[model samples]
Target: GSLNMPAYVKFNYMAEREDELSLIKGTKVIVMEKCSDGWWRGSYNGQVGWFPSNYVTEEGD
Candidate 1:
């Protein structure tokens, strides 16, 4: 499925790999996809990439 939700960055993570997304502790992003493998794809600062939920929290009510 598709999404248009904002996520909050809980921790700063440096992406050492190409596919993974770099995280910013004080950043907000758009969550696009949630995979069963436990990774989330999101758009960050106009750059789309993947990161774990532990690094970012999907802020929603």
Candidate 2:
């Protein structure tokens, strides 16, 4: 099925990889560096490096 609503990822928001990282809401994450799997090598404040693609939804899709 096509997307009915535009999917989006709010920065710093915790979404799940295996499930969903909804532990934190409206946090501040950084899309830094990168890995091979299309996941953003990112950071939340002082913590650093890669989160999975499943951790994020699409952008205006």
Candidate 3:
């Protein structure tokens, strides 16, 4: 067993521009990976999905 701390993030604004799962403003999430296409893969509320990077702000910046 191992414990890993991934980057924490939050939705800066609602996400509804793509077919991916929509996120609520201010919702906390864990970023898994960032895509070159300006999108990031993350998880929230037990759901893992892709969202626009611009729609979220990583912790500490």
Show where candidate 3 strays beyond 4 Å.
Answer: 1-19
lDDT (Cα, tens digit) per residue for candidate 3, span 1-61: 1122244445544546453645667566667667688777777666667777776667566
Against the correct fold, how does model 1 do in TM-score? 0.82
Q: What is the C-alpha RMSD of each candidate to the true structure, in Å?
A: 1.9, 9.2, 4.4
lDDT of 1 by residue, 1-61 (tens): 5587789898998877777888899998788898887689988885788988888878643
TM-score of 3: 0.61
RMSD of 1: 1.9
Q: Cα lDDT of model 2 overall?
A: 0.45
lDDT of each: 0.83, 0.45, 0.61
TM-score for each candidate, following the candidate numbering: 0.82, 0.41, 0.61
Number of colliding residue pairs in each model: 0, 4, 0
Clashing pairs for predicted structure model 3, backbone only: none
Better of 1 and 3 by lDDT: 1
